[PDB]
Amino acid sequence: SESELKHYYNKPILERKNVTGFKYTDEGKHYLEVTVGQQHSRITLLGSDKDKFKDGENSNIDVFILREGDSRQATNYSIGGVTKSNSVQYIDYINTPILEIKKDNEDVLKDFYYISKEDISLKELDYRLRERAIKQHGLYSNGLKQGQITITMNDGTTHTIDLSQKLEKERMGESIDGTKINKILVEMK
Numbered sequence: 001s002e003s004e005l006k007h008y009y010n011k012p013i014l015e016r017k018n019v020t021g022f023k024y025t026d027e028g029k030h031y032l033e034v035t036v037g038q039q040h041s042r043i044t045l046l047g048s049d050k051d052k053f054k055d056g057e058n059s060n061i062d063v064f065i066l067r068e069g070d071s072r073q074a075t076n077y078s079i080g081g082v083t084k085s086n087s088v089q090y091i092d093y094i095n096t097p098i099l100e101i102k103k104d105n106e107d108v109l110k111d112f113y114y115i116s117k118e119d120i121s122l123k124e125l126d127y128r129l130r131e132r133a134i135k136q137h138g139l140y141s142n143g144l145k146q147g148q149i150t151i152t153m154n155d156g157t158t159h160t161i162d163l164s165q166k167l168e169k170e171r172m173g174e175s176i177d178g179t180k181i182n183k184i185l186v187e188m189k
Contacts, residue, residue, distance in 0.1 A: 002143045040074065046080065048174060064127075066123070066127065095179060097113055097183055103144070116178075129184065130163070147187070150184070152182050155180070
């Protein structure tokens with residue numbers, strides 16, 4: 001549903017880099033606990049992120065946190081969005097790829113997307129692209145609600161995301177090489 005999708009993709013984000021978190025298991029499930037200031041978060045690990053970080057204390061991780069429900073308890077319960085921090089710390093490289101956005105198969109923008117992160121999560125790319133389609137092009141308003149983001153890598157590999165649904169939760173912890181994104185296409189209809 002249209003209004004629910006806009007709700008979800010207008011939730012605020014807690015985004016921090018070079019943090020430390022604690023990875024544990026508890027009743028067949030896998031979690032990462034993280035505290036940034038007096039702000040407290042528990043991130044469920046569902047996909048391949050389960051095996052990508054070893055249980056126990058994890059340093060040099062970046063975090064992209066979104067609170068799944070509407071309950072107003074202080075602790076954040078999020079899914080995925082954990083990646084390895086940049087392995088070059090002393091310079092911040094930012095690379096452009098091409099960014100193209102389409103409504104009803106005509107371009108409405110042809111420009112650039114900027115990427116600072118070596119290891120970047122589909123949770124983050126999904127959220128931020130939808131944020132842009134929503135705020136500047138009126139996804140998900142009247143009722144523009146379908147589909148296709150396509151991220152094309154340097155080797156021709158692609159990742160595609162349906163706009164008519166939230167990103168699949170098992171994909172929110174998947175990550176790609178942000179230094180090697182050649183193009184991002186967002187088609188709306």
